[PDB]
């Protein structure tokens with residue numbers, strides 16, 4: 108009869124058999140015109156001879172043997188898939204991510220294929236826009252965009268681990284989303300995850316995910332400097348890979364959110380993509396994904412972008428208003444490089460201004476993170492300057508689920524935040540247990 | 556919205572309310588446009604689709620048509636519920652629907668947990684909670700709010716929607732209402748207010764009433780206000796909701812490339828859910844998409860309701876909360892009901908979380924059930940099993956925090972993983988890592 112599958116399972120590559128044409132390597136970020144320096148992804152590598160960032164470079168020549176149409180159709184034939192690799196919004200674009208990993212080593216939770224919402228009501232009643240979308244990277248297994256990166260990173264690591272290569276585990280020194288996504292993926296695969304922290308930076312609340320995921324969290328008696336000293340001293344005496352902010356392998360998974368944005372728009376290029384970004388790699392990552400789609404010819408243009416920044420966070424904005432003539436190569440260089448290439452813009456949000464944009468977006472039905480506030484603030488501003496027209500297809504990237512920011516909204520709505528009006532707050536309304544009284548609170552609210 | 560909009564439609568499809576499990580041959584049917592709530596017996600209602608019209612198209616036609624909507628960003632179609640419109644609210648205009656593209660939820664392979672804890676290789680968790688609101692309720696509210704939107708749009712007296720819930724239904728409800736500009740009203744006793752628990756409705760600009768009484772007298776004012784004004788009270792036991800929800804069963808099949816799982820595990824807090832799944836699978840069977848329907852399991856919290864007692868006694872003592880639905884369902888798919896003590900559900904949670912997950916206590920209740928089923932040998936190690944996760948784990952942190960710090964009264968917390976203290980000394984640190992690795 109209807110053979111569903113063979114009793115036992117565990118689990119189509121765009122390439123010549125018994126000989127995979129694609130490959131990638133580590134190269135220095137935006138290296139010289141004629142440079143040879145490289146590293147295998149199999150090497151545990153963090154900087155480049157000069158102490159500079161690394162960037163994963165894919166063999167563009169291999170990929171190009173196959174035309175634009177080839178790749179749109181290949182990627183499109185994997186939408187809706189339930190198979191070991193293809194499910195993931197990252198692995199479905201494996202060839203352009205980690206072309207050489209065996210599917211047996213991938214560590215996926217089916218990240219990607221992220222909600223691309225249409226802010227009909229917010230666009231209209233607030234910006235006069237009819238084609239504003241929000242890309243919910245936060246609606247994932249972890250609560251953030253960081254799952255795109257960790258899937259790749261943990262895959263690469265699981266690969267080195269299974270090759271009898273030496274990697275006993277993964278280390279980290281973060282109390283946020285990276286630590287959460289990193290501990291998650293590692294746990295699914297059975298790879299130890301170690302978090303290193305000064306004891307004065309422990310918060311059961313902030314570490315709920317790694318703790319829940321089985322991470323070995325060290326609460327160390329020293330400050331951050333002394334904690335970094337140990338990490339460095341440990342990793343050098345134990346093959347433990349540190350997942351660092353600067354890791355370029357995470358960028359290979361994050362770049363898929365851009366490809367996906369194009370995919371979801373049935374390969375049409377948006378006029379503007381706003382990337383929030385306390386973390387400067389997020390925007391380069393998007394740029395890399397949009398650039399790659401174009402290099403390979405899946406589309407003809409790359410979208411203009413916005414690096415929306417929180418007030419006084421970094422000097423990125425100061426640099427932009429003065430056409431970067433005071434710039435010199437938090438990793439700004441990748442942001443700058445990326446904004447140059449796409450003729451981008453950088454814009455700001457005050458602390459009060461992001462909370463208000465959040466209340467406005469939230470009143471429209473969304474339940475967003477501070478960074479989307481910054482993004483939307485950037486948008487409300489760029490709109491007044493006539494830089495973003497009303498009919499302009501704009502996508503705002505949301506990197507973390509709103510459920511991670513409740514305490515922020517609570518404080519706001521109950522007018523409990525210092526230095527801020529909290530003008531759009533909606534606290535509950537007090538009323539006597541009297542019929543008529545209640546009919547009044549109601550009659551007005553609503554109207555007549 | 557302006558895209559699919561062309562006149563082509565002389566809409567062959569339709570639906571209406573009929574009493575739940577209607578006696579053989581019944582003229583009793585109300586229009587979905589009406590605001591009804593009980594049948595004539597005082598009994599429940601159900602949304603019956605006209606299986607007649609729907610059958611002029613085969614299984615192949617249905618599997619193909621839905622699959623063509625996957626990955627789509629078209630007006631209603633982006634949605635995991637609207638992609639299945641024809642079987643949800645076939646008569647609503649596209650301009651009426653209120654959607655945030657809910658659905659198309661993650662179907663995760665619990666590879667590690669399955670193998671390491673049960674000896675199962677094809678255990679999947681359907682994360683209905685990873686969404687806009689953080690719960691399964693989006694599925695249901697998109698439909699309710701849509702239908703409410705429609706009645707209203709027809710310059711119809713519907714000044715607002717009301718609720719007397721501090722949970723998920725309310726969060727989902729106020730979200731949909733806000734996107735639509737439909738006032739949402741939460742009525743509550745002053746002693747149940749919590750900025751914490753009402754964070755989402757509040758954020759969503761719902762009009763939250765903090766009334767100076769208790770629950771009973773609060774229920775009274777709602778009765779009073781609703782007879783004077785057309786505020787549609789989001790029935791708990793409301794039937795438009797199940798129409799939205801059934802699509803999660805449909806999605807599960809669509810997800811296995813139209814293949815039927817051997818077991819679906821629904822953590823039955825709200826009994827309508829398990830019945831919603833069955834409705835979804837049985838609809839795919841009748842219409843010829845698949846050929847079987849999965850056996851199911853209603854996972855309960857120990858002592859929740861008489862459901863379990865009714866089950867351990869082959870439903871011999873049962874008479875027709877919304878228990879009947881569950882019964883009717885578990886009978887038709889030769890289902891099972893199973894219990895989870897407070898402790899059991901937490902430990903399971905700690906075991907699933909340890910494998911990469913980060914789940915709500917109901918999935919704790921499902922896995923517990925699964926664990927017992929595997930022992931009794933009822934569920935086989937190679938059975939394609941799907942556990943349904945109804946709420947996002949981020950809404951249950953305090954639970955885990957307390958569990959992982961050994962502070963939950965009358966429970967061991969066998970799997971607490973608290974952070975470990977060590978001095979800032981290299982041997983000291985090397986020692987602890989040595990044993991751990």
Ligand SMILES: *Cc1c(COP(=O)(O)O)cnc(C)c1O
Pocket residue numbers: 253281282283284285286351352353357386388389
């Ligand atoms: C999120 C992110 C970081 C920072 O991680 P935290 O855990 O929030 O410190 C650094 N680099 C990249 C590329 C990131 O995405």
Ligand SMILES: *Cc1c(COP(=O)(O)O)cnc(C)c1O
Pocket residue numbers: 692720721722723724725790791792793796825826827828
């Ligand atoms: C959630 C739900 C309800 C009621 O909401 P609460 O938050 O549980 O009060 C009623 N019926 C069904 C089917 C539900 O899923």
